[PDB]
Amino acid sequence: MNPPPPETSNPNKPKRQTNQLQYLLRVVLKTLWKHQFAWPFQQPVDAVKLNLPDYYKIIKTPMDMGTIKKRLENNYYWNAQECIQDFNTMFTNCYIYNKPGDDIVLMAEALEKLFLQKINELPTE
Numbered sequence: 387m388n389p390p391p392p393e394t395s396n397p398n399k400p401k402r403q404t405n406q407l408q409y410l411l412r413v414v415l416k417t418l419w420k421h422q423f424a425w426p427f428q429q430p431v432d433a434v435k436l437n438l439p440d441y442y443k444i445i446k447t448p449m450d451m452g453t454i455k456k457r458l459e460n461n462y463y464w465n466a467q468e469c470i471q472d473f474n475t476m477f478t479n480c481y482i483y484n485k486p487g488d489d490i491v492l493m494a495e496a497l498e499k500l501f502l503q504k505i506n507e508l509p510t511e
């Protein structure tokens with residue numbers, strides 16, 4: 387079976403709005419969502435559908451943009467870095483599971499370049 391997706395709401399964590407978290411949802415997630423390379427990253431990797439039975443043997447911290455969107459909308463992160471770390475995990479999962487130069491890896495690298503361009507414009511803490 388696929389594993390259940392990552393946790394996205396936790397009723398026992400404190401909640402806040404910050405400049406950075408707002409920007410992460412309204413600008414960074416939005417911009418990446420619409421990129422031509424985004425669709426394989428928009429929901430968890432469906433290892434059953436793709437016939438990739440080793441994916442969740444290899445990738446033990448799955449992450450995707452659907453889950454990040456949900457964490458942001460549910461105020462799951464207190465610090466912007468937690469969200470930034472989730473985007474990084476999503477990219478590195480793709481680099482760990484696949485091989486250098488793979489086309490799916492080039493698609494991740496392009497999304498990652500864009501993500502860094504938007505993170506450089508994060509508003510002041």
Ligand SMILES: Cn1cc(-c2ccc3c(=O)n(C)cc(-c4cccc(NS(C)(=O)=O)c4)c3c2)cn1
Nearest residue numbers: 425426427428429430431432433436480483490
């Ligand atoms: C032979 N083969 C390999 C793949 C493959 C290999 C690695 C990846 C990968 O690392 N990511 C993050 C995503 C995909 C992928 C590609 C196309 C569609 C989907 N759909 S999904 C998000 O429902 O799992 C996922 C993906 C697909 C597909 N066919």
